[PDB]
Ligand binder design. Structure first.
Ligand code: HEM
Ligand code: HEM
Lengths: 727, 727
């Protein structure tokens, strides 16, 4: 029709812009100059729209897209209307099955680059030269919930990276904790079914807090280590940018001379580590179920690119048997105090997709997708994974040509004798469809193994044993890793752990399950169990009080890299602040505030009790971003309240509640001049307290005190005051 | 190993029990004696479990289900482990595509029964006798969100009913408002795409508060009427039990003599109409995303069975053109003040399913499944629907034999010449697979139409017109029904409509879209338009202030049946109350309370600061159902606080906050004896106020006040005081 506004405000600028400033858009329209080899090769499937006629899928122009063909304008719809039937038919078949686990996920494009050559330890081409740039596609996700479930639930997180290398696709499919719940792949459907919604009524969504999950845990102690990680704050991250990444299993690195080294993969966040606190996370699933997906997308649009460092834990083959635990057991970690992480390269995420369904929903990752330079090991969880990812993709993606969907295709060449199958795209001209053949002179040909561009050959490991269905005796210890984890947390992190267990077990209906869990906790640590017991109204038996604790792990009694906050690594860039306005804000306060924030790279959200504009005291006009109710304190990292006509909002229930909720969730609060009246709303002493920044006006140290607290992420010293406070 | 507790507390009693007292279970173990003819025919495929051996799907007993087959205890997994591959293969293929629309839903079994014979107006066998019972299967749902989205979002609700009649299956596939958003089926994909998550980032989940939906509404004024319904409290029901249901389309009833009568279908809830308030509903999507599903399962387990009256709006064929609106326009309703609802029968839901996937997820409903005695009309929306439901079940359910999935099978006989297709169950013995045939003497055979047991014949309506793609000019009126709806609401209902519009338009990023929507509202009612506009910081122009309001609907100024609350119809039976405990409860108070609750069928939940138990002053050991934080006020209808050691919970942040939320959300609160100390937390009344029940002790008088308030659902008179409460 020609319906866009003349002034053209229906379309966002194609340049970096702060969260909420402009409408978000497909990646190639927001950042058309952000390119890589993978992005460039997708140009053959991209479709525009501007200046084109509206057509059927066969290319016939459509004259009327508002009506069906009928006999009379009030008559029956005719069967001969092929335009209507095509339109509704495509609509009716839009959906494909979601992923059996990790259905909910958010993705982006980027690139990886090695810091130096690793030709000494591996012959993988993508790690061989500091100038080789490798394009990546990454998907972050939850585990339990469906694709329409919420982002900030309590759960393990997935971290999958598809490396488009020159010698093949390499998929590193990891998680956000260094261990998994079970030892053998044979139990995966059992563990998955226990955590997922119960089979009679399909409840509950996105939660482990129900009878069957805890039943399975109390009968299978191997799950205790990863259960400790999920009940800690590791289970509710602040953002996909601020969590750690792990491969979990021990793999092999193979060099040109044929030597094998054992490796555990690590992803280290450059924005540091941060998480939410339970009541904020749970509330946040209602006020904004898409908070992580939204933050990821907006961070890239604003230029705050997620950056991670790839790291390796390296173990010589001769050291296979030197630890207290088995290296092939995925319920056990390798303490950084024993085997340091070597920082090897970096990944940067700098462009969003164009179409979620086509790039994200259809992407397929699989741990079996490795390259020459790498190899597997006998970890029994990894072993059964190799079977599963190829099999499941046959029904999810509809056939064996899933590698022909544009986001999954390699950028390097691929030729073989495989043919046909549903949805076949490639037209092969090879006269032969088998080898050995003389009709095409045996092409394509096998290629011997070598130091570069050679064929894949498996490491020749020795196997000796009988065919048995049995667990290795070295896999039989379940309590010392959990205890190592428990003793490395800070005191306030231990408290959050206790509260996660108490909360979750309180939702378990059958009381005997709660009691058996508590018993299992008494084998890990007594203080932990006494504390969980008292919140559930349980008494420990005298026998439970004398259980002997498990041993140290190779002499360690703590490892600080297991805590989120022991060794702080905060980075305030990309964090966001809430500024609550009034109808006559002191513009001198506002300019000192906004300029300090921009200097550190922190975003501001200007809030008010209605939408539209507000006029500052010097006549300056401020556009309002959202209302107090529309952008709750759950969404910001800290609150600033500037001087001005404070009586405008001193009596508004939402403005006050905004300060009580943030105060409760331990975020820093700043009050300028008469905005100090608000201290009475949160029971702050006249004297003041750590975490509340207050001054006569918003000037000098005001902003610097505020930004120091933001780098410390939350105000842990206030824990003691929040139990009162009705928020 | 891993067995049940000695006391048998792992299993639920097979008798009606209140919500939360026991673990929920599959319907056939919870109510073995509840039967109907559909439930009994499902006996062929129900599978048990106690006392059987674990096997593969080929029936081979499994010796060890904890491990994979490997070469040695720490060796590689063997390809020949067929037990392992069968187990993982089935898991890898568990998911099927979710429903294109209405993916999130909850179902139950029950039966329908007519009040009188309706053979003067219809030859429909299920309506011909008061003593004839028809088994039904009903599915309630949201529209927009995926299958793992939350229950209490703002959206339209689906109300689908499958009738297993003796002359075929009849599906009455309706909604909870009497009109739809659009007129022609050709625009369905356009409207659904605008409301669903945006295509570049897949945000937002289960919400219409985003740019593409308001864009579409502002350019298609036909949608305004159902947008009014959605922005009112009709968009957020308290329960599937407390909402109305409609077929929307005008349909036809045909009697034995061939006479036709136009009909609109209604469902009237015998528990009455009731809804949440927005703040509550949004927060409840985070505290329990599965609330409507839970509540339905639990009401059926408690014996508070969902019951509805089927009603008909009947209009003679000669009165087709006697209204100011076209009867075939699905964006127009038929005021009950003009054509009353005749009550025809009752439907009762009395049993949950055994397996949610097998019965709820594979069920297929379709508005084209009618039986002799019913017929269609030329409503252009209805007409397009007939193509769609059959088409989409071919991919969702895998082939053309979906009528052979047990939940979908007819209980009457079905025979024809259709053969083959994927997963074909029935083995045909008929030597012929075509007709006419002489080799089987032509059976099965066609049956002529008649009064009972006849073949289907369409009503022979005259069709006169040219083949055009054109909207009837009679459908070109968009503003008088929304005006009629606005003027029939109570004043507090009106405020909530304004608040829903303001809230959603505040989330639209492109400001010109808000302005256009507000412009459209000015054609309906200038008071409504002005209220929304003030909240968005928008000034109406002089031009807009002089828009002539639309005309009346056949002389009506208003119709009270369009409001939820103008004519009170509430029932307290099945509602739930929170009782906040302390460590020394006055047993006398507690017994007066529980007795009265039990007399009216009101359930109770005893809450505390920890789980386990408390002892009342006389020793009546009280088991705690959940904590304050664990079962928030959002999930109950009213709050009671008994006397006792009140200093136990007087300074508990959670217990004070609990009363402030219930107060904000207009729920009745009862305070006894020293519990009156809590009046300071909700800072109000010295002499008391309506909505707050106080007394020295909990007696008969106290309880009757509280029960009279609960029958009115919420305390509307408290609206003007909530704006100042910080909660
Ligand atoms: C170390 C333990 C494991 C980790 C870290 C892990 C990680 C992941 C991640 C991140 C995804 C989502 C990929 C995406 O974004 O599309 C995924 C999917 C999946 N995983 Fe795993 N997983 C583990 C164990 C297993 C096991 C033992 C099995 C089965 C034997 C399994 C079967 C699957 C399947 C079937 C999918 C869906 C794949 C698809 O639909 O493309 N996983 N896993
Ligand atoms: C008055 C308007 C409409 C109403 C009241 C309505 C109602 C419903 C309901 C209640 C369901 C869910 C059934 C279940 O529980 O499985 C549903 C699903 C569906 N609707 Fe409609 N709908 C309407 C308009 C349309 C239109 C115009 C189309 C297409 C032109 C359409 C296509 C579908 C499809 C394809 C499904 C999924 C069916 C399945 O997967 O089994 N609907 N609709």
């Amino acid at each position: 029709d020609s319906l866009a506004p003349e002034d053209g405000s229906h379309r966002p600028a194609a340049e970096p812009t702060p969260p909420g400033a402009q409408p978000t858009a497909p990646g190639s329209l927001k950042a058309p100059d952000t390119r890589n080899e993978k992005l460039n090769s997708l140009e053959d499937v991209r479709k525009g729209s501007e200046n084109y006629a509206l057509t059927t899928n066969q290319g016939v122009r459509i004259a009327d897209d508002q009506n069906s063909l009928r006999a009379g304008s009030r008559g029956p719809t005719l069967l001969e209307d092929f335009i209507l039937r095509e339109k509704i038919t495509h609509f009716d078949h839009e959906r494909i099955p979601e992923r059996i686990v990790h259905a909910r996920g958010s993705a982006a494009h980027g690139y990886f680059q090695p810091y130096k050559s690793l030709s000494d330890i591996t012959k993988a081409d993508f790690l061989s030269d500091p100038n080789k740039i490798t394009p990546v596609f990454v998907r972050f996700s939850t585990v339990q919930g469906g694709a329409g479930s919420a982002d900030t639930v309590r759960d393990i997180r997935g971290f999958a990276t598809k490396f488009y290398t020159e010698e093949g696709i390499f998929d590193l499919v990891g998680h956000n904790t260094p261990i998994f719940f079970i030892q053998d792949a044979h139990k995966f459907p059992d563990f998955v079914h226990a955590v997922k919604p119960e089979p009679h009524w399909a409840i509950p969504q996105g939660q482990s807090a129900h009878d069957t999950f805890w039943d399975y845990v109390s009968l299978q102690p191997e799950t205790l280590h990863n259960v400790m990680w999920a009940m800690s704050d590791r289970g509710i991250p602040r953002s996909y940018r601020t969590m750690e990444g792990f491969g979990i299993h021990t793999f092999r690195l193979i060099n040109a001379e044929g030597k094998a080294t054992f490796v555990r993969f690590h992803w280290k966040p450059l924005a540091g580590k941060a998480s939410l606190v339970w009541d904020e996370a749970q509330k946040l699933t209602g006020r904004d179920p898409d908070f992580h997906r939204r933050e990821l997308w907006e961070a890239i649009e604003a230029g705050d690119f997620p950056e991670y460092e790839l790291g390796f834990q390296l173990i010589p083959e001769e050291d296979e048997f030197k630890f207290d635990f088995d290296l092939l057991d995925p319920t056990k970690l390798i303490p950084e105090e024993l085997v340091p992480v070597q920082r090897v390269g970096k990944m940067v995420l700098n462009r969003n997709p164009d179409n979620f369904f086509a790039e994200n929903e259809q992407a397929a990752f699989h741990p079996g997708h490795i390259v020459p330079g790498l190899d597997f090991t006998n970890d029994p969880l990894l072993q059964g994974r190799l079977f599963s990812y190829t099999d499941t993709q046959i029904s999810r993606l509809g056939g064996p040509n899933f590698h022909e969907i544009p986001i999954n295709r390699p950028t390097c060449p691929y030729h073989n004798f495989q043919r046909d199958g549903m949805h076949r795209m490639g037209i092969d001209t090879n006269p032969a469809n088998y080898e050995p053949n003389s009709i095409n002179d045996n092409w394509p040909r096998e290629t011997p193994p070598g130091p570069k561009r050679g064929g894949f050959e498996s490491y020749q490991e020795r196997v000796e044993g009988n065919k048995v269905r049995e667990r290795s005796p070295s896999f039989g210890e379940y309590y010392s890793h959990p205890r190592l984890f428990w003793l490395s947390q800070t005191p306030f992190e231990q408290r959050h752990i206790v509260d996660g267990f108490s909360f979750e077990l309180s939702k378990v209906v059958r009381p005997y399950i709660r009691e058996r869990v508590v018993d299992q906790l008494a084998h890990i640590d007594l203080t932990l169990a006494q504390a969980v017991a008292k919140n559930l109204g349980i008494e420990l038996t005298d026998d439970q009080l004398n259980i002997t604790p498990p041993p140290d792990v190779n002499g360690l009694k703590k490892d600080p890299s297991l805590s989120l906050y022991a060794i702080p690594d905060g980075d305030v860039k990309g964090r966001v602040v809430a500024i609550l306005l009034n109808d006559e804000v002191r513009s001198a306060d506002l300019l000192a505030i906004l300029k300090a924030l921009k200097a550190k790279g922190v975003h501001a959200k200007l809030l008010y009790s209605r939408m539209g504009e507000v006029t500052a005291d010097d006549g300056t006009v401020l556009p309002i971003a959202a209302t107090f109710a529309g952008a709750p304190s759950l969404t910001v990292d800290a609150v600033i309240v500037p001087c001005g006509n404070i009586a405008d909002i001193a009596d508004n229930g939402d403005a006050n509640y905004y300060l009580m909720e943030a105060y409760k969730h331990l975020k820093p609060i700043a009050l300028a001049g008469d905005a100090r009246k608000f201290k009475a709303t949160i029971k702050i002493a006249d004297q003041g307290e750590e975490g509340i920044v207050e001054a006569d006006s918003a000037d000098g140290s005001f902003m610097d005190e505020l930004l120091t607290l933001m780098a410390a992420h939350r105000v842990w010293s206030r824990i003691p005051k929040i139990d009162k406070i009705p928020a």
